[PDB]
Design a protein around this ligand. Structure first.
Ligand SMILES: Nc1nc2c(ncn2[C@@H]2O[C@H](COP(=O)(O)OP(=O)(O)O)[C@@H](O)[C@H]2O)c(=O)[nH]1
Length: 486
């Protein structure tokens, strides 16, 4: 007993390219409210969609050890194709080998030629199915509606090539898409069943949480008694809100459920400490392994130069291959990608965000900032040969956030600020960063509070700061102060 269950499609692409519009058009044109997933049936078969644009949540639920997605559809606007963020989607979908279907969206415009997309995307191992072929190219239009049926046909044709094996008789097993709390009904989950069946009444374990399905809502808001092999449902009964990547399984009784939950929490507690020591760049050589890196530069040119330089490294003892690469700060999505791929973070003139910081703290993965290009490559080659491993170089002691700017016309750029980390003192170099990208690098000019010139400010104390031979310090910047460790 075995049948083809369903394909699961995730929509990814650049911002403002039509992900939400394409996602909504199929839902509103095939047959309110949203739960996190839905499904539509065609003549050849039925396919399910996760109504959440990807490249962010696609990896978030993958780093926990679950792969609900088996088809990824890229959307690129005909007008202006392939943005420095479609490449990020390509790398995210290539880290976990999944079929990709490309669908140009904005073809209902004068300047909407698709051939520049076809050959520009061709140099990404996404060559079209007319010259070589590993991915189709169907033109759709979310607003007008043309070409969608061909898109569904292409998705189904790509899917039928894969395994598509499931048994709609075994005890249910699946993954949770999203969870939410409500004063009525308490905690609510949006589990996606993958194999078996989830008839109402079963004893359900989801990660740490456990319970039973006292109520079940379908995707359209109507209660149902049974769940298919790949039909998303919304269950009630768990004792706490689950995460977005846990596994839902059917067990026998509550005692076994509690034993498994305690074992799972113990294992999760134990796993975290291993990455905090075995995941560092100084321990990769010790214990091929194809060392992976994630790079976040500040300017595209430096990123291209660094990728070109890091090309010819690694012959027989460990190899190097970048799995990321983008312009901007270290987004939490990049940290999730590195965690799922067991890579290491490299930050060129960029700082991690709050979410990136908390993900780094939880996963305990290596994360280092670098100032000059050649230090990155020298550290990479030194770690490849595995000779030395220590911090040094620089250590940030004190970060201050500007509040307001009152630059006086008497050749001054005095900016008010409040210290949010560490302490700031006079005779150290400073570093002004806006939008997590550094803009200036130099010393100070004045750090008085009102007129005292304290030359040392404790954390949490408002003061005024002055940058030497620099201006245009807007509101919302940060000043970090560091030491060139010798
Ligand atoms: N002319 C045209 N415009 C489109 C089409 N699809 C989307 N758009 C435009 O895209 C905008 C919506 O962008 P949206 O999908 O929300 O961005 P996203 O969520 O980041 O993918 C709308 O204002 C539409 O004008 C299309 O097929 N034709």
């Amino acid at each position: 007993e075995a049948v083809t269950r369903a394909p699961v499609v995730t929509v990814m692409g650049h911002v403002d390219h039509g992900k939400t519009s394409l996602l909504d058009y199929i839902r509103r044109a095939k047959v309110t409210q949203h739960i996190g997933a839905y499904h539509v049936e065609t003549e050849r078969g039925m396919v399910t969609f996760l109504d959440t644009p990807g490249h962010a949540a696609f990896t978030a639920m993958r780093a926990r050890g679950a792969q609900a997605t088996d088809i990824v559809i890229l959307v690129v606007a005909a007008d202006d194709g392939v943005m420095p963020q479609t490449q990020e989607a390509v790398q995210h979908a290539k880290a976990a080998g999944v079929p990709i279907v490309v669908a140009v969206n904005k073809i209902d415009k004068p300047e909407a030629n698709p051939d520049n997309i076809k050959n520009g995307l061709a140099a990404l191992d996404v060559i079209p199915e007319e010259w070589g072929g590993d991915a189709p190219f169907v033109p759709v239009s979310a607003k007008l509606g043309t070409g969608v049926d061909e898109l569904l046909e292409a998705v189904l044709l790509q899917a039928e090539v894969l395994e598509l094996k499931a048994t709609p008789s075994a005890p249910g097993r699946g993954v949770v898409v999203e969870s939410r709390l409500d004063k009525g009904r308490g905690p609510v989950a949006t589990v996606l069943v993958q194999d078996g069946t989830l008839r109402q009444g079963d004893m359900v374990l989801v990660g740490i949480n456990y319970g039973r399905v006292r109520a079940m809502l379908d995707e359209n808001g109507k209660p149902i008694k049974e769940a298919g092999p790949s039909i998303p449902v919304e269950i009630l009964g768990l004792d706490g809100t689950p995460d977005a990547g846990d596994e839902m399984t059917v067990v026998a009784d509550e005692k076994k459920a509690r034993e498994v939950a305690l074992f799972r929490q113990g294992k999760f507690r134990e796993v975290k400490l291993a990455r905090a020591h075995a995941g560092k760049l100084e321990n990769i050589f010790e214990n091929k392994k194809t060392l992976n890196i994630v790079l976040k530069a500040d300017v595209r040119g430096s990123l291209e130069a660094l990728q070109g330089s890091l090309s010819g490294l690694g012959n027989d003892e460990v190899q190097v291959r970048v799995v990321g690469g983008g312009v901007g700060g270290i987004t939490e999505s990049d940290a999730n990608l590195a965690l799922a791929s067991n890579a290491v973070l490299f930050g060129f003139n960029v700082r991690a965000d709050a979410g990136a910081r908390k993900i780094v703290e939880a996963e305990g993965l290596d994360m280092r900032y670098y100032n000059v290009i050649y230090d990155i490559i020298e550290d990479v080659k030194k770690a490849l040969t595995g000779m030395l491993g220590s911090d040094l170089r620089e250590n940030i002691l004190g970060i201050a956030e500007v509040r307001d700017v009152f630059r006086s016309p008497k050749f001054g750029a005095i900016a008010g600020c409040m210290v949010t980390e560490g302490m700031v003192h006079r005779n150290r170099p400073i570093r002004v960063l806006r939008d997590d990208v550094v803009i200036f690098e130099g010393e100070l000019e004045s750090l008085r509070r009102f007129k005292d010139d304290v030359a040392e400010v404790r954390a949490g104390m408002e003061c005024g700061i002055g940058v030497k031979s620099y201006n245009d310090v807007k509101v919302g910047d940060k000043i970090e102060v560091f030491e060139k460790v010798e």
